[PDB]
């Protein structure tokens, strides 16, 4: 329940940067979506935390900074260079940890004037981003004469909360953030780095406050985060496939969660009458997901198991049959494009041709002598027993 | 229509979110995606209710949700601008069109008809009043983020995208934020309401519960098919086989006169009556002819190569039987066996013929090693459906 | 100067240091506690600057390129930016010359270039025009210098380049590929004054600069493999030393950087731990030293597993933390799908049940195939499952 | 050994016309490059007699030849111009000197030393006399076009630029449509006398046959031979191979008091021979070293991945024998061979040692498959001299 609530946050105080890694069905981006969340009470993103997602073309220019065309003015187009989402968060993560700090920081009066202009929704008009370009240039002029111990503990924690960070080209996304991102190379650690960047020249440090909470998966393993430099800044939290909430109780607690007594008596006995046909037995998903997990870790790998957001979803037996034949056996399939012999197996059916088979063997042959099966739409009690033959 | 295709999308999609319709080629994937679509929201043209996009390989993600375009304004003509693409303009046009109806949006009621009105503008935005439409987007996402989850839970609109050909293009990189968004209690008003933050325009951005994306992909290709295991658990694949069924006698006649309801049901009753009498007074031929290859296409081939029924579906006599035969799906037997003469011998079931009624006559010169290849021949009349009653 | 004397005695002989290592070394600690005790700057800035390469870092940014600069009303004046390497290289020329006094005639007018180098507001048209006329002035005076004055200048500045395989090296170094050298540095054997591409000025390297590159040699395909880049930069292999993993070797380490009164909880919360691990001081050590090995010989040299992973353990559940989430999630990166090997890099290959981090699932393939699972441990039988390694 | 590849590059500059010294690296064919060129041409300084241009990936042909670039001109008045490279201006500065001092072009020779100042002007050009350089440059070329190719057959400043680092450089960029004039036979007083016109600024352009091209190119990243073929046929190669004659002990006395011969050289000789009495009582010790490993090299990968002599020219004393050996050669050669034992201990000659005194100490575990990896070890002292020893 809260395990792996405190598993996150105690290595986003020890390394810094967590990534639930793992195959994909499980809940990664929903436990991580939970750990914020319930971390800053605060339910949308904003200042508190930014959600994003890496894709191949989130390049560097508009992750930390880049050239950005922007005049608000319909004339004189000023081609500035703008902070990306990250410099826009490592900068309002600094500048909201310079609040609590009682005579260290001496700029009570232009760090809040910098923090409303580093919060404001609104673009910023010229005459003001003149203002906001030379008050960050006095920030790097503050950072650098604060002791350490005076900026190792900045109180509000800020959390960029990354997705799919496998996805994007992590080593080019990430540019001068790939030496900062150890907890002892912030502002504040043992050694701190006030790294330069390039672009517009003005120099750059994480704060403590700011945690990268970054889910991915690694069932692609064309995409994987296999840079052995970015593996010791994160720390790497296995997040498996865990069968144990498909039980009826685990099920019952995970989805009369959020329904106030009204619609959880029609789920109450919607799910009584689920288990009421697959044989009365309260512990059919969690060995049905098992048995194809194990039967999927000896033939592919342990990273293309089968998760439990597929069938955490059914009410009745109705809905597992369309979760069977349309989300699963097309992704049993595509594991094993005319490989016929092993996904057989992992329905263990292997023996079995004809009959309650979900692929009947076809009466041809080849003239070769080859031979290839066809998927049956099974429909009523008789899925029920392809299914169970499984267990 | 309503009967298995039509139920079995609008069930799923209803629950999953997204529906990819993957099947071989010359079945109705593209065509039962467009008949949904338009019984659905009664609009037999894209625009308001629903789009018809479809994807390739030179398709961008800077075109499909949020990249620099540049523009021509009139005294700077080299003018960088960011431009939401068309699934931006969808999902927007999805959620202040679902946010009419709402109890909470009290103080910009019109703001939001302000905002439907831009992104309806099929003229191009000036830059005059694009900064009108960037301050109504960003007054948008500060809205929903004071919208409870008990209230985006039911938008009575319903939009759809109909992308065709999804598989074609870089879907990794098409879906950039889209395979995160992309579930039903990952949009809003879901279980999870997650609100991405998006690159370029640094504006917030979550699809709406009131998108639909009902994807078509081909597979018969390989090297384009969809094996991303984190993007095939967003969709929810149904797999629409070739079906021999609708090549009956009975069905040929329903699926034909149901589309062309004018008076020529005499004229089309009376021709597919004298199309079958030369075929034996056989009302199971072409059900029995596409099965008959299809099965021994998967035995030999991929399960996925299979002769769909969009060939055969628009037949009307022995003379078209033999357009669409030698020129439509014998070019394409001869692409999936090229060169390979006993297997595609075999297919058309002609393996010990080599000589009279056959399509394929053997070549009385033999090669330098051994080897010897074969020749089409083109047939007519009586002797065409003598070399057609072999495959069934 | 343990490693300062490699690294202090390699910089007076060839001019710059790539510090190449596997990950997890101290190889940017070294680089950075070096300068910082040499140049007595905790931060950036006025004696050295840290940067660092990456795929979208190219040559316009870090030397000289061209840039648009709109200030308040003006046209977009395309004007020349120097990048990173020129605004440390004329800085430490400037500062070189302003110490001493032969033939640089206008003190006040190099001490003006100088005011104009350290700006951290960006240059005014007003006030880069003199700044463009100024840096002419100086390589017209440089260039009328003898070599026995430009030999030998006291500030030496330092420009370190943390992560230096990760740009593209020969495009970077684009004018700098054959001036880094020590012969043809600004008052070597050799000095060469070579044009820059878009100004259009002679630039030349002064020396001063040393170049202190930290190559990440774990990955390859993006290591130095071109040889013209392997001669100018003298490479120091910095070996992950497990020496630093014993009981008093991490116990001087953390109370170095820590105060006096946690000093003593420290030393307690050490002792704990070594007391939870057998009474075994060379615990630690021989656990990284063991499974070093196993990584020299089966896969490489320089892919084993660090000194920066175990060096911050203060408890059993820190090391367990340590364990189950630094460096297993590395180990089934680097063998991934290989279980016949990680068993062994454990030395786990005959036990399959039991204290092991990986169980063997009971059923086999269906083609003589058959997988593991990383079973997670907890308490003295998860020490039973380490000291079994060693 | 210095005037025998002066004597070589001489004879293939006024066959050829161009060269290019690519060689491993640590050989002195930049070194060889820049001496030769002061030696001949009696200018120390890079500077109106010759140039150095280094070639990148970002070198383009706006500044090599001529780009446009603004200026400093009136304040709501900047203006592009026509701002020509390097070699633009090194081809027309041996133009104009070599009209200088002709007899048959006294038309207007008080004019040309105006053109000579011009472009030995080392500063950008002034606006207000940028107009007189574009002038006399258009009276040059008006000039050049009406005269013979008898008087234009040889010029006598020869000129030199000097290119380091050919091959890094994208030569079909920044040679657009002129790589065709570095042939003698296509140069300004060939018989195929070829001026072209430049694509910016409408000006003609050819090379004058005294400006040669010495190009100085590593030959060990990925190129052999088939790498530069837009320049391999105008271009003569010299190999400048690493000559471990340097490395005797009367070799590298006179190499560094060549330069250094004040008083401090006699402290050299004391701390030389201090270097080769520990190195047993041979003088031949560095240049056994250097051959027994450069033919180790050429026997296992190729010719041109050879150790170049400037490793150990600069070394005094064992501890900087011991610099060079740790930290630049063997780092060296462990790339060369990433992670294959059995032949980096064989570069050595130490296959049969496992420890005791070798660079490369075996580990005591073995292989699951049976592979064995050995660990670099660190000497000192007397020791390093004896596994030096066994190299030789
Ligand atoms: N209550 C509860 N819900 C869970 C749990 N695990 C998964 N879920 C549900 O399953 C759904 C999908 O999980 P999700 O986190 O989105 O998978 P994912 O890892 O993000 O998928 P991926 O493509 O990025 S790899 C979520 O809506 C979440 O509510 C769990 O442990 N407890
Ligand atoms: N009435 C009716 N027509 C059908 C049916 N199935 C296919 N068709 C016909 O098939 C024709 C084309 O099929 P279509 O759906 O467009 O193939 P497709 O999915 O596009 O094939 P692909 O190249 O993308 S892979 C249409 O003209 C349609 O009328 C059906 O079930 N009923
Ligand atoms: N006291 C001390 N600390 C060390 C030593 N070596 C490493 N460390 C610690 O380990 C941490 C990580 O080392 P670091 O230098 O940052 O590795 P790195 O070279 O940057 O790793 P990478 O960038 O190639 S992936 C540092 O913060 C430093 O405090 C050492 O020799 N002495
Ligand atoms: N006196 C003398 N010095 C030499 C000789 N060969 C090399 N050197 C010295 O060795 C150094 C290296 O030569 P250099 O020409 O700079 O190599 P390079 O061609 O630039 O190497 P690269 O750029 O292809 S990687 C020079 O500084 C030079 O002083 C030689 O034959 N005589
Ligand atoms: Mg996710
Ligand atoms: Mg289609
Ligand atoms: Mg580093
Ligand atoms: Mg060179």
Same mark, same amino acid.
Request: hydrophobic fraction near 35%.
């Given at each position: 329940?809260?395990?792996?609530?405190?598993?996150?946050?105690?290595?986003?105080?020890?390394?810094?940067?967590?990534?639930?890694?793992?195959?994909?069905?499980?809940?990664?981006?929903?436990?991580?979506?939970?750990?914020?969340?319930?971390?800053?009470?605060?339910?949308?993103?904003?200042?508190?935390?930014?959600?994003?997602?890496?894709?191949?073309?989130?390049?560097?220019?508009?992750?930390?900074?880049?050239?950005?065309?922007?005049?608000?003015?319909?004339?004189?187009?000023?081609?500035?260079?703008?902070?990306?989402?990250?410099?826009?968060?490592?900068?309002?993560?600094?500048?909201?940890?310079?609040?609590?700090?009682?005579?260290?920081?001496?700029?009570?009066?232009?760090?809040?004037?910098?923090?409303?202009?580093?919060? *404001? %929704?609104?673009?910023?008009?010229?005459?003001?981003? /003149?203002?906001?370009? &030379? =008050?960050?240039?006095? !920030?790097? +002029? @503050?950072?650098?004469?604060?002791?350490?111990?005076?900026?190792?503990?900045?109180?509000?924690?800020?959390?960029?909360?990354?997705?799919?960070?496998?996805?994007?080209?992590?080593?080019?996304?990430?540019?001068?953030?790939?030496?900062?991102?150890?907890?002892?190379?912030?502002?504040?650690?043992?050694?701190?780095?006030?790294?330069?960047?390039?672009?517009?020249?003005?120099?750059?440090?994480?704060?403590?406050?700011?945690?990268?909470?970054?889910?991915?998966?690694?069932?692609?393993?064309?995409?994987?985060?296999?840079?052995?430099?970015?593996?010791?800044?994160?720390?790497?939290?296995?997040?498996?496939?865990?069968?144990?909430?498909?039980?009826?109780?685990?099920? *019952? %607690?995970?989805?009369?969660?959020?329904?106030?007594? /009204?619609?959880?008596? &029609? =789920?109450?006995?919607? !799910?009584? +009458? @689920?288990?009421?046909?697959?044989?009365?037995?309260?512990?059919?998903?969690?060995?049905?997901?098992?048995?194809?997990?194990?039967?999927?870790?000896?033939?592919?790998?342990?990273?293309?198991?089968?998760?439990?957001?597929?069938?955490?979803?059914?009410?009745?037996?109705?809905?597992?049959?369309?979760?069977?034949?349309?989300?699963?056996?097309?992704?049993?399939?595509?594991?094993?494009?005319?490989?016929?012999?092993?996904?057989?197996?992992?329905?263990?059916?292997?023996?079995?041709?004809?009959?309650?088979?979900?692929?009947?063997?076809?009466?041809?042959?080849?003239?070769?002598?080859?031979?290839?099966?066809?998927?049956?739409?099974?429909?009523?009690?008789?899925?029920?027993?392809?299914?169970?033959?499984?267990?």
């Amino acid at each position: 329940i809260k395990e792996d609530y405190f598993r996150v946050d105690m290595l986003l105080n020890k390394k810094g940067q967590v990534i639930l890694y793992g195959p994909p069905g499980t809940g990664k981006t929903w436990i991580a979506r939970k750990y914020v969340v319930e971390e800053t009470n605060e339910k949308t993103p904003g200042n508190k935390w930014e959600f994003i997602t890496f894709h191949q073309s989130y390049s560097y220019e508009e992750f930390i900074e880049g050239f950005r065309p922007r005049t608000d003015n319909e004339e004189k187009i000023r081609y500035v260079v703008e902070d990306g989402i990250f410099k826009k968060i490592a900068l309002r993560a600094l500048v909201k940890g310079l609040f609590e700090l009682e005579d260290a920081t001496i700029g009570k009066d232009k760090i809040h004037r910098l923090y409303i202009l580093l919060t *404001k %929704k609104e673009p910023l008009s010229p005459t003001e981003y /003149e203002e906001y370009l &030379r =008050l960050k240039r006095y !920030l790097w +002029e @503050l950072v650098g004469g604060l002791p350490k111990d005076k900026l190792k503990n900045l109180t509000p924690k800020f959390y960029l909360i990354i997705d799919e960070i496998n996805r994007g080209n992590i080593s080019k996304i990430f540019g001068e953030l790939i030496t900062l991102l150890e907890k002892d190379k912030r502002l504040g650690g043992e050694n701190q780095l006030i790294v330069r960047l390039p672009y517009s020249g003005e120099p750059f440090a994480v704060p403590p406050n700011l945690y990268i909470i970054g889910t991915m998966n690694t069932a692609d393993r064309s995409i994987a985060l296999l840079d052995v430099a970015l593996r010791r800044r994160f720390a790497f939290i296995e997040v498996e496939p865990r069968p144990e909430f498909l039980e009826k109780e685990n099920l *019952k %607690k995970i989805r009369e969660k959020k329904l106030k007594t /009204e619609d959880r008596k &029609r =789920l109450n006995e919607k !799910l009584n +009458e @689920l288990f009421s046909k697959l044989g009365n037995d309260n512990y059919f998903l969690k060995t049905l997901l098992e048995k194809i997990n194990v039967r999927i870790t000896v033939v592919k790998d342990r990273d293309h198991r089968i998760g439990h957001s597929y069938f955490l979803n059914v009410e009745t037996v109705e809905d597992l049959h369309h979760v069977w034949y349309y989300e699963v056996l097309p992704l049993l399939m595509e594991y094993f494009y005319n490989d016929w012999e092993t996904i057989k197996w992992v329905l263990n059916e292997k023996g079995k041709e004809h009959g309650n088979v979900f692929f009947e063997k076809l009466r041809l042959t080849g003239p070769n002598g080859e031979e290839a099966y066809q998927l049956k739409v099974l429909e009523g009690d008789a899925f029920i027993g392809a299914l169970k033959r499984i267990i």
